[model samples]
Target: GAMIESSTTIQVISAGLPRTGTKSLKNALEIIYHKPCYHMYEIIFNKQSDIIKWQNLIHDSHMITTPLTTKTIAIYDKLKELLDGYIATTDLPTCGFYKDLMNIYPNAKVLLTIRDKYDWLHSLRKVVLPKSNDPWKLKIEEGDKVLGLNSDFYKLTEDSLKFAFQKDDLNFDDDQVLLECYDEYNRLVQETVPSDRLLVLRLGDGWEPLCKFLNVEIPNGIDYPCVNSHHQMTQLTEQLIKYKSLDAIIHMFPDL
Candidate 1:
C-alpha cells in the first residue's frame, strides 16, 4: 500500500442582497470554521497592499464596483493554496463572472440568503436608496425604466417589485413577470447547482438552518446584530398610502 496526502478546502459564496444578514453569517462562519472570511467591505478597503504586491493577479480596473472579477478568481485560487478554506461574500448572485468562478472552483459551496421580497424591498428603500452614491445605483435607475416606472424615488417599493420580475423579452404583466423571476431564479439554482453544495437560507430564519448546513454548533446566547438600522421607507410608505395604485402594485407581487 502507498501513502497519500490529501487536502480539503471549503469556499462559501454569499449571493444575497446587501442587508440580508450576510455580515452575521460571515462572522459566524469565521468563528465556527476558524478561517478568515472575506466580506465586501474588507476586500474593498484592506486588499490594497496584497493587491499591489500581487499585481499580476489583478485583472479588472473597477475592482470596487465589480468585486467578483477575474482578479478575484486569481486571488481566491492563491488563497485556496494557502488556507484550509475561505468564505467570500458578494452582493451579486452566481451569474456572470461569479458563475465563471463556480466553474473554476469545482469544490466550492454556495449559500443564497433570501428574504421576503416586500421586506427586502422595504429595507432597500430605506437603507440602500438613501446612501446609494455609488455608480452601481445607476443600474437600479435604468432598471426602473425597464419596469415602466416613473423616475420618482417615492415609488421605490413598487418600482423594485416591478424591476425584480421584469424580463427583456417577456410580455407578461408586471406582477406576473415578477413572480416568474422570483420562481425562475430559485428554480435555476435548484436545477444548476447540486443539492449537497448549495444552501438557501431565509434571513428571517437566522442561524439554526445555516449552522445545520455547515455542520457547526450554533453559538448560544449570541444576538444577531442589525447590520442596517434604517427605518422602512417613511416617504415611500407615505406615498404608497397616498396613491392607491402604488399599494396595489406592491400587493400584487407574490409572497416569498
Candidate 2:
C-alpha cells in the first residue's frame, strides 16, 4: 500500500494453501496473464536450478546469487530476474515465502486462495498426507517417477509442507493442531496483507470474481479449470514418489 509493492514484472501471488485449487489457479493465471505461472510443481517436479534456489531461500543457503544472497538485503531487480519471465506465483515453496516475496515485489497483487477448512484439510489427508504416513505407503501409486531420481521426493514433499505449516517438527496427524495451523496461517495472511491489494479466492468462485480481481476478461468457452482433485493429486503424488533418482524427478514434469 505504501509504495505500491516494489512494482516488478510479477503481477500476482497466491497466498493460499495446497488442495485449494492451486493447480487450477495456475492454469487460470497462464490463460489470463499469457505467461508462465510458478507453482510447487515447478520445484518438487521440475527444474534443479529452481530447486537449489528455493532450498537457498528457505534455509538461507548459498545457492542464491545476484539480487539475492543470504545477506540481509537483495536487489529487487535480481529478484525479478530469478523468476525469469513468470508473471505470477502460487503454491508452496513460494507460498512459504509469501511475505518475503511480497517485499521483493511490493506492487504485485496478492491472491489468497482458500477453501472450507474441513474440505481442504480432508483433501490433503486423503491425497497428499497418505504418502507421508510412515513406512510411507502412498494410497495410490501410478508407479511413475524419474527412473533414476531417488532423492527422497517424499521427504521433499513433507519438508515443503512443514515449511508452509512452519512446523519445527512434523507429525503426520489430522487433529485439531493441524486444523489450527491452517487456520492461523490463513488468519495471518489475511491480517498482514493490505486488503485493497489482496483478493481471497476459492475453487468454487468460478470465473467472474477472479477475472475482475485481475482486471482480465474470462477466457471464452473455458470455465475456471478444476484440476488436481484429491484422487488425481494423490495419484500424481505417487507418480512423483516412484522416481529412482533425483535427476529422474527433475527430468520428469517438462509437461507440468
Candidate 3:
C-alpha cells in the first residue's frame, strides 16, 4: 500500500516545542500558509478517539518508514489522509512525529522556535504539571489497566514523556534531567531538519523573519500575537480543565 498524496498538502510544520513561541508561530503560519494549524489544543478539543489515534501512531513505531514497522503503509496512509484538510501543523504529537511529517509532506517548510532553556522548563511547571486536566499526565488509578494499547502504553504513552523523561512519567521532576531533555529536543530538531527547509525562529524576531522564511508579505498593522506567555499558557490549561472546557481528561485516554 502507498501513502496518500496530501489532500491539501502540508506546507508548514512548526517544529518547535510548546512554550517556545510555538503558539505565535502557529498564529503566523495560519495566515502565511493560509490553512488551519494543528496544535496540541486541537487534539484536546477534538473527539476522544483522537487521543487513541495519536497513541496508535506513538506505539506503531513505523509512522515514517518501513524498517521501522510492519504497519508503515497502513498507518502512513491513514495519517496523510487525516491531514488532507490541514496545510500546517505544530506542537506536540506532531512535534514528536516531525521526521514522519517530513516524509509525508516532502516539500513542506519547517519552523523551529527556540527559547531559553530555563525559561521553557519554568513554563512547563505551570503549564503541564497540574494534576488535573493535563492531557500529558495520565490518571494513575487508570494506570493498572491497559486499554487495548501495547504493553508500553502505561509504560510510556504521552509522546514527550514516552521520550524525554528517563521514566514514562509525565511529572518526572528532576530539574536538571528535565532541562537536559529539553535541550536534547531542540538539538534533535536541528539535526533532523535540513537547514534550508528549517527556519529557526525566536519569538522576538517578529514578522519580518517569519514572512521572509515563508516567502510571504508581512501583514501590515497587525502585530505578532505575542500571546501564550507562561501566564496565558497556564491559564489556558486551567480553563480547559477548570470548566472541563476541552474534555482534557479523556484527552489522555480516549478509552475513558
Q: Number of backbone collisions per candidate, in order?
A: 1, 12, 0
Off by over 4 Å in 2: 1-8, 61-70, 74-81, 131-136, 139-149, 234-256
Give lDDT per model, in order: 0.48, 0.68, 0.64
RMSD of model 3 against the true structure: 7.9
Q: Which digits, one per residue and each the tens of the lDDT, describe model 1 over residues 1-256?
A: 2323323344566555555666666676665556656553333233423332223322231242323566656656654442234555434212212343465566667777777766654455454453345453454444333333444322332332233333334332243444456556556656666778888887667677776776656766775434433432343333344453443455532210
Report the lDDT tens digits of candidate 3 across residue range 128-229: 443345554443223222222333433333564544232344445566766777788789889878999999988699999877886677776778767667
Off by over 4 Å in 3: 1-7, 62-70, 130-157, 161-171, 236-256
TM-scores, in order shown? 0.50, 0.77, 0.74
Question: Candidate 3: global Cα-lDDT?
Answer: 0.64
Worst 10 residues of 3 by lDDT: 140-149
Residue pair clashes in candidate 1: 165-178
Judging by TM-score against the true structure, name the best candidate. Answer: 2
TM-score of 1: 0.50
Assess candidate 1 and give its lDDT. 0.48
Q: Which ten residues in a row have the lowest lDDT in candidate 2?
A: 1-10
RMSD in order of candidates: 12.7, 6.2, 7.9
